[PDB]
Amino acid sequence: ALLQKSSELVNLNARTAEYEQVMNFLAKAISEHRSDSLYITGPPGTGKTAQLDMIIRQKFQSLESVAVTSINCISLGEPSSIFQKIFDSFQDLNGPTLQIKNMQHLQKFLEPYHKKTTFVVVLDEMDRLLHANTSETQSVRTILELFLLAKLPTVSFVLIGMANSLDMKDRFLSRLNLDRGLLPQTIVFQPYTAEQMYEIVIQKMSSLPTIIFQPMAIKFAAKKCAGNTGDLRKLFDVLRGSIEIYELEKGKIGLNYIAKVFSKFVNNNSTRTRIAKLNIQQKLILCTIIQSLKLNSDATIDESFDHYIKAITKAPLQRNEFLEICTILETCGLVSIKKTKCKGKTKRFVDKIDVDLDMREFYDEMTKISILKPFL
Amino acid sequence: PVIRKFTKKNVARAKKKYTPFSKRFKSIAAIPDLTSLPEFYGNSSELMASRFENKLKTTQKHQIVETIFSKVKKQLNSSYLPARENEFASIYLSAYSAIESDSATTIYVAGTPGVGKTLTVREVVKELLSSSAQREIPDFLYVEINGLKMVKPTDCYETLWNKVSGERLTWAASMESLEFYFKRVPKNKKKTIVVLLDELDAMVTKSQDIMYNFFNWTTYENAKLIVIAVANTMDLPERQLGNKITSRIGFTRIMFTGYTHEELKNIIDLRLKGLNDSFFYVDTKTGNAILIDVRKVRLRMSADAIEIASRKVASVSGDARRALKVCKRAAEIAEKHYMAKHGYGYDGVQTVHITHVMKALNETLNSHVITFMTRLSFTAKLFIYALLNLMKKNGSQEQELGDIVDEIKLLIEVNGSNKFVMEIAKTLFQQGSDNISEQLRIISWDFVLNQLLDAGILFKQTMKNDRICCVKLNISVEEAKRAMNEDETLRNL
Ligand SMILES: Nc1ncnc2c1ncn2[C@@H]1O[C@H](COP(=O)(O)OP(=O)(O)OP(O)(O)=S)[C@@H](O)[C@H]1O
Ligand SMILES: Nc1ncnc2c1ncn2[C@@H]1O[C@H](COP(=O)(O)OP(=O)(O)OP(O)(O)=S)[C@@H](O)[C@H]1O
Numbered sequence: 074a075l076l077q078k079s080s081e082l083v084n085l086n087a088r089t090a091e092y093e094q095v096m097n098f099l100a101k102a103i104s105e106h107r108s109d110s111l112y113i114t115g116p117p118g119t120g121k122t123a124q125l126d127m128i129i130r131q132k133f134q135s136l137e138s139v140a141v142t143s144i145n146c147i148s149l150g151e152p153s154s155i156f157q158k159i160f161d162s163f164q165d166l167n168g169p170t171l172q173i174k175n176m177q178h179l180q181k182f183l184e185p186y187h188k189k190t191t192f193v194v195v196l197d198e199m200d201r202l203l204h205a206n207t208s209e210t211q212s213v214r215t216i217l218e219l220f221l222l223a224k225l226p227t228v229s230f231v232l233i234g235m236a237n238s239l240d241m242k243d244r245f246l247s248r249l250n251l252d253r254g255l256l257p258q259t260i261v262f263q264p265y266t267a268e269q270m271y272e273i274v275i276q277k278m279s280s281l282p283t284i285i286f287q288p289m290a291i292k293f294a295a296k297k298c299a300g301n302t303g304d305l306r307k308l309f310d311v312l313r314g315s316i317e318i319y320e321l322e323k324g325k326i327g328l329n330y331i332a333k334v335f336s337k338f339v340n341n342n343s344t345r346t347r348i349a350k351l352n353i354q355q356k357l358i359l360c361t362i363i364q365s366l367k368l369n370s371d372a373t374i375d376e377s378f379d380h381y382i383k384a385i386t387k388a389p390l391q392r393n394e395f396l397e398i399c400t401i402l403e404t405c406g407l408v409s410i411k412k413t414k415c416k417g418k419t420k421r422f423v424d425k426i427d428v429d430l431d432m433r434e435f436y437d438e439m440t441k442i443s444i445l446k447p448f449l
Numbered sequence: 450p451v452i453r454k455f456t457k458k459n460v461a462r463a464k465k466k467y468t469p470f471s472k473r474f475k476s477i478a479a480i481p482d483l484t485s486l487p488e489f490y491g492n493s494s495e496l497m498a499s500r501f502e503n504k505l506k507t508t509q510k511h512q513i514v515e516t517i518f519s520k521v522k523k524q525l526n527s528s529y530l531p532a533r534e535n536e537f538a539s540i541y542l543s544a545y546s547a548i549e550s551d552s553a554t555t556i557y558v559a560g561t562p563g564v565g566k567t568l569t570v571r572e573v574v575k576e577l578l579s580s581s582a583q584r585e586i587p588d589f590l591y592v593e594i595n596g597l598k599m600v601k602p603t604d605c606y607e608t609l610w611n612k613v614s615g616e617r618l619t620w621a622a623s624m625e626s627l628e629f630y631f632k633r634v635p636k637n638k639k640k641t642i643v644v645l646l647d648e649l650d651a652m653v654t655k656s657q658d659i660m661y662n663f664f665n666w667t668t669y670e671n672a673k674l675i676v677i678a679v680a681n682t683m684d685l686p687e688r689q690l691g692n693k694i695t696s697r698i699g700f701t702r703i704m705f706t707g708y709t710h711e712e713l714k715n716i717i718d719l720r721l722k723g724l725n726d727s728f729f730y731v732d733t734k735t736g737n738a739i740l741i742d743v744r745k746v747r748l749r750m751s752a753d754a755i756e757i758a759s760r761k762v763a764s765v766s767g768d769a770r771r772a773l774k775v776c777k778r779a780a781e782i783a784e785k786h787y788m789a790k791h792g793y794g795y796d797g798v799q800t801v802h803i804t805h806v807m808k809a810l811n812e813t814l815n816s817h818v819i820t821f822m823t824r825l826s827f828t829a830k831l832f833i834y835a836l837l838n839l840m841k842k843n844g845s846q847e848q849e850l851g852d853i854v855d856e857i858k859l860l861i862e863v864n865g866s867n868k869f870v871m872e873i874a875k876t877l878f879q880q881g882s883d884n885i886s887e888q889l890r891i892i893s894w895d896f897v898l899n900q901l902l903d904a905g906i907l908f909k910q911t912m913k914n915d916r917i918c919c920v921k922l923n924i925s926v927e928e929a930k931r932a933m934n935e936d937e938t939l940r941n942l
């Protein structure tokens with residue numbers, strides 16, 4: 074069971090290149106003061122939830138008195154239910170009525186009756202809440218509203234932000250950016266040198282290895298993942314698949330998966346294009362759609378079939394053969410036929426045609442067929 | 450008492466509780482063992498579906514009569530296989546390495562409709578239940594979430610928490626309950642559960658929160674769920690889901706490719722292994738065939754007919770359901786020939802061949818619009834002819850109706866020589882009688898507008914002015930050209 078004990082997908086443990094950087098943004102967690110004005114904002118999969126498990130797992134165990142429970146910004150949707158879920162501290166009788174109006178009714182609850190104690194909540198996936206109200210109206214309004222740090226008594230009620238992928242970071246406004254609270258610190262957490270990260274996950278071991286993964290294949294895996302944004306959860310589902318395709322024989326085999334899932338999504342632009350088409354009637358029609366693009370952008374299948382009897386007019390053929398042979402070009406993954414608005418003059422639905430790949434390699438695909446050269 | 454502004458007299462509310470699983474005990478350290486609980490995981494009162502069973506059974510009467518082709522039309526219904534092995538093995542290994550390792554994986558299958566993905570996934574779950582009965586693994590509670598079998602796309606929470614827990618809440622209480630049960634409850638008190646997300650692209654609604662939660666409960670260490678979500682397009686999280694949820698779904702992405710003609714021939718061979726070339730004891734009096742007056746009859750479901758039915762359906766979309774539909778229509782055609790030729794009626798050998806299955810292969814390759822516009826009325830063909838010859842003058846495909854009217858009047862006035870059109874141009878404008886003035890429109894004009902509007906040949910835009918209401922040919926112009934050339938009168942008119 075040494076192959077099953079190689080679990081790389083969900084595990085107990087930036088621990089890769091920024092260990093001093095994560096261990097120097099946890100300052101005032103024992104002095105009962107305000108620590109850091111940081112905003113964790115990075116690519117989706119770098120390890121923000123990973124560091125923010127350990128940063129509280131240091132301060133969970135025998136509790137100076139700290140009571141802290143983590144929740145998420147999931148069942149909110151609208152800016153309506155932010156404050157009720159964090160109110161399971163002393164399970165009070167109040168909470169529904171007095172609290173959800175105003176900041177001074179939560180400033181009423183910032184002073185601690187039961188000693189200084191501690192209660193710092195970490196609202197998780199906080200960019201998911203602020204993506205409503207369509208300009209700023211009650212979500213970006215709430216983000217410029219709940220980052221006020223105005224009165225600072227002896228009260229431990231800080232809240233670090235858990236922002237998601239860089240979808241709407243670079244969109245700002247002067248209310249969000251002018252000296253109120255926890256703004257001016259944001260860090261990209263991209264795990265470069267993830268080879269050493271995998272070495273830490275395997276050396277933190279409970280199942281002794283004999284033949285380790287080859288670091289040439291490990292560095293090839295770390296090369297062929299971090300070009301897009303550098304997702305680590307994406308790379309964690311690659312070596313697991315490599316040892317899963319190793320078990321299908323009952324670095325030499327941890328490569329054909331990426332050389333398998335890159336080629337599978339890619340397939341062949343022109344080599345398999347005609348190969349799969351093998352049929353000429355499944356070949357020249359793609360040229361008919363190519364000629365039905367530089368005259369009209371509302372390429373109806375009729376327009377793909379009025380182009381058909383403006384090319385072959387030199388055993389009959391009905392429209393059903395054309396629209397079912399187009400399903401082959403649908404099945405392979407080139408063409409899109411669905412109902413759209415059909416702007417035109419009247420606005421009722423009809424079929425469309427669209428193509429995806431750029432006309433560079435397909436123009437080299439016709440260099441072997443002598444009948445698809447005059448149609449270009 | 451009060452006078453109300455409106456009424457809601459026809460309202461029906463369920464009996465569903467509002468407080469979630471987080472407020473049962475309010476003690477995380479004292480959660481009882483959820484596995485061997487009486488209500489949880491379907492351990493009590495599992496007759497909750499079989500209440501309506503003795504409603505659709507009536508009389509066990511009157512001696513139903515099977516025929517020689519009723520057997521094949523029963524074996525060609527919904528029900529090792531030499532079709533999916535490199536997908537079955539990878540899926541069962543990827544779902545077994547999490548059952549044995551208490552893990553939280555997510556498998557992603559996809560394919561165009563018919564490639565057997567839900568069949569192989571349900572057989573994977575049946576085999577894992579057999580392994581659980583053999584007790585080489587722990588057991589699980591199996592939940593199938595069909596994306597289209599629910600009236601609200603947020604009822605996935607309700608049915609999942611109901612299947613897990615035996616209690617039914619509202620959808621908000623169910624999503625908070627499932628969030629707590631998948632975050633905080635430790636892995637000693639929960640047995641694992643496998644979730645089939647059937648037809649995933651119907652729960653992407655307005656927030657992507659359901660797609661968030663079902664793929665973000667599996668990133669937790671403390672949640673033992675395996676999501677084996679199926680789909681209908683391979684690049685779905687690149688089209689309609691976020692890139693973070695693409696990173697959640699990951700890199701497995703095992704595609705169920707289309708079938709081949711050899712695989713489809715093997716499929717129909719296994720479907721008819723028990724019936725092909727066998728012997729039946731029919732009776733001359735009725736036709737009631739019985740497999741091993743009385744006539745011993747063979748049954749040659751011919752391999753050439755099978756492969757010529759299989760090559761076309763292997764080309765177009767490659768579906769192991771459409772192959773069964775073709776080979777069931779062939780048996781239906783055979784049974785109809787047999788019953789009509791013998792006078793049998795409901796209460797030599799028999800064959801299915803190439804020039805007998807070609808009708809089942811041609812029943813779905815016929816455009817019955819040409820044979821519709823030929824049998825159309827003369828005024829409707831004249832309408833279509835006026836629309837067709839306005840197009841060469843205009844070049845818009847969207848001619849007005851006042852133009853069609855004047856073009857019809859132009860054709861009728863410019864053909865004053867033909868005996869047919871001088872016989873018909875009296876009735877066309879005055880219904881063949883006097884005491885009726887010459888109408889501006891021809892008789893049956895709104896009728897032949899509506900008879901093509903409802904049929905989808907014609908396509909008129911909505912407006913109040915029936916001189917400038919535009920009109921488009923929704924089908925085509927080439928097939929209208931090939932349908933207007935067999936009239937013997939419109940070919941010259
Ligand atoms: N240094 C690390 N060591 C071990 N596992 C890690 C490490 N960094 C990340 N992970 C794993 O990868 C996951 C990534 O965590 P997340 O921060 O949630 O990813 P993400 O890109 O931030 O997604 P978001 O926050 O929803 S945009 C963690 O939950 C761990 O399972
Ligand atoms: N290899 C096979 N062996 C037997 N039956 C098959 C096979 N492949 C497909 N089928 C038929 O397909 C049905 C199973 O449904 P599937 O086609 O696997 O579901 P699907 O591919 O997701 O189709 P949709 O789009 O979800 S309705 C069964 O009832 C079979 O009759």
Ligand SMILES: [Mg+2]
Nearest residue numbers: 121122197198
């Ligand atoms: Mg996270």
Ligand SMILES: [Mg+2]
Nearest residue numbers: 567568647648
């Ligand atoms: Mg299905």
